[PDB]
Every structure is written in structure tokens, then in C-alpha cells.
DNA sequence: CGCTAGTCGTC
DNA sequence: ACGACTAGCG
């Protein structure tokens with residue numbers, strides 16, 4: 261997520277009901293739904309008892325979209341990016357410590373506090389995702405596991421024209437350049453739609469409404485690939501890009517303290533991390549499910565070299581990318597857990 | 609005062 | 620891994 265982005269661009273948002281997309285295609289950031297579902301059966305998931313309540317949760321939202329004539333494409337996160345492996349292991353450690361804290365709370369009679377604890381102790385596994393995939397496939401619902409982040413895969417589906425809107429709780433999708441993003445959608449279909457075309461309605465953005473400048477602002481403000489410099493949020497990131505007249509973002513960032521009248525010494529690792537974050541939003545690997553090929557989100561541009569971009573996702577053979585996309589190949593172990601083949605029955 | 613970030617409650 | 624909200628900083 262980009263902290264505060266939704267409130268900063270409030271004027272580009274409008275309340276909608278998903279009926280608006282009747283006869284259209286919509287891609288879903290399914291781990292958001294798996295998460296809410298896993299909270300509803302957290303005591304069983306953390307301890308180790310078998311449960312499928314999270315499956316019923318996701319299918320309630322899938323069945324609501326289908327009732328309104330919407331063709332949903334459920335996208336799932338895949339492999340972790342190299343730069344996020346310490347983060348994903350640190351998350352496992354906090355979830356296991358919250359499981360121990362919850363057990364301790366139940367022993368002290370604090371049942372309500374322990375039940376809360378368990379909700380922050382759950383791991384969303386590929387095996388949980390695969391159960392949702394199977395349930396959705398029986399209903400005729402297409403599923404796709406992104407090679408890496410679902411954010412990039414979803415942005416690809418929308419930029420390519422396959423889907424007309426992205427349902428997600430993550431404002432990163434706006435930074436990736438999605439045209440229509442549906443945030444805060446409830447089980448009944450009510451939600452907040454942000455349209456990229458309406459970014460011009462936001463007086464706070466000024467001229468920071470182009471895809472390039474908007475992405476730069478989101479990165480400078482603090483993003484999932486790079487924390488901000490201290491004292492920098494959306495208002496100051498936007499102010500810097502508004503005041504600067506220069507195509508080169510690297511020169512602008514070095515001069516950041518001057519534009520804001522702040523004491524900012526820009527570290528060496530900040531400039532490099534910025535270029536890496538920018539390259540991740542631009543060139544992260546996604547899967548074209550029609551041609552069944554692993555490709556970068558955008559075609560490579562003049563100032564980059566693909567061999568330096570392992571942090572944006574490593575290439576694997578197209579056949580391996582296809583087994584991952586169908587849900588047949590476990591994202592953590594690389595074991596073949598299923599044999600689904602779309603031919604012998606999105607991928608057409 | 610505008611803004612950012614630390615605290616706290618919950619999904 | 621959220622947001623609300625306010626203290627407290629520049």
C-alpha cells in the first residue's frame with residue numbers, strides 16, 4: 261500500500277456498486293479475500309485443526325460478482341521477489357510469536373484477547389489458495405497465480421484490456437498504472453472506485469497526474485519497495501514533483517531538501533533503491549495467459565539493462581510459468597500438487 | 609498551522 | 620503490513 265494515497269486523491273474516487281460492470285471482466289486481488297476469510301477461522305488455522313471456512317468466505321464474494329453478471333478473474337500472489345525474502349521470513353516469525361502469545365492468553369483466561377491474537381498469527385499458504393482455486397474453477401471461474409506479485413499481474417490484466425477493473429484493498433495498483441481500481445468492496449458489491457482519468461480532478465496533485473509522475477510521487481512518499489526519507493509523505497513528495505522542472509528524477513531527488521526548505525542529505529542507497537523501486541513497478545515479471553509466456557510488465561526502455569533486473573523477478577521456462585499460473589505448482593516447494601490442464605476440458 | 613509518524617484497536 | 624487519531628515536530 262501507499263500510506264495515505266486514497267485520502268490524498270479523494271476527488272478521483274466515487275462510490276459504486278459492482279452492477280456497473282455487468283457484462284464486463286474484473287480481476288481480483290484474491291489474497292485480500294483469503295485474508296479476511298482466514299481471520300473468520302483463525303483459532304482453527306493457527307492451532308492446526310482442519311477448516312474450509314475461508315473457502316466459503318471467498319466464494320460468497322465470487323458468487324456475488326457472478327450474480328451481477330460480472331466475469332471475475334481471481335489472481336493470486338506467487339513467488340516472493342528476492343528483495344522481499346527477509347520480509348517474508350520476518351513475517352513468519354511474528355506470526356509464530358503471536359500464536360505463542362495467544363496460547364499464553366488462553367491460559368490466563370483472556371479468551372477474547374487470544375482470539376484477536378490468532379487473527380495476526382496466520383500464514384496464507386499456496387494450499388489454501390489452491391482450495392479457493394478448485395472451488396472457483398468448478399463454478400467456471402478463471403484463476404491465475406502471478407509469477408511474482410499479484411499487483412503486477414493485475415496491472416498487466418488491466419493495462420492489456422483483458423479486465424476493465426481491479427478489485428483490491430491495495431493502493432499500489434494505482435501506482436502501477438491501473439485505469440480502474442475498486443477499493444473497500446463489501447460482500448454486497450458496494451465499493452469505492454478510483455479512475456486514473458479523474459486524477460486531474462485532484463487539486464492537491466497539480467500536474468502530478470501522469471503515470472510516470474504519479475508513480476514517482478508514490479515511491480517518494482514511501483512504498484512497499486522503498487521507505488521514504490524522514491519527513492517525506494504524499495504532500496511533500498507531490499510538492500517536490502510540482503516545483504521541479506527537469507525530466508531526470510535522479511537530479512530532482514538529490515535536490516529534495518532544497519525544494520522543501522528541509523535539511524535533507526540524500527544517501528547513496530536511497531538513489532539506488534529509488535531506481536530499483538521504479539524498475540520494479542515497471543518491469544516486474546507477469547504471465548501473458550493467452551500466449552502463455554513470462555514477460556516484463558512494460559517493454560524495456562532506453563535507460564535500463566534487463567540483466568541488472570533480477571530484483572524484479574527471475575525468468576523461468578514458460579512451461580514452469582504456466583504450471584505456476586494454473587495453480588499446479590506449489591509456490592513455496594515447487595512440487596506439482598495438481599494436474600489441471602485448460603486444453604483437455606483466459607488461457608485460450 | 610500542515611504534515612508525518614507513533615500508538616492503539618481491529619479485520 | 621491495515622486505518623483512526625492525535626501529539627508533537629518542523
Ligand SMILES: Cc1cc(Cl)cnc1N1CN([C@@H](C)c2ccccc2)C(=O)c2c(O)c(=O)ccn21
Pocket residue numbers: 261291292295337351384409411430432484620
Ligand atoms: C503479509 C500481508 C498481510 C496483509 Cl493483510 C496484506 N498484505 C500483506 N503483504 C503480502 N501480500 C500477499 C502475499 C498477502 C496478502 C494478504 C495476506 C497474506 C499475504 C501483499 O499483497 C502485499 C502487498 O501487495 C503490499 O503492498 C504490502 C504488503 N503485502
Ligand SMILES: [Mg+2]
Pocket residue numbers: 337409410411430
Ligand atoms: Mg499485493
Ligand SMILES: [Mg+2]
Pocket residue numbers: 261411430432484
Ligand atoms: Mg502491494
Ligand code: NA
Pocket residue numbers: 481482488491492493494
Ligand atoms: Na512517508
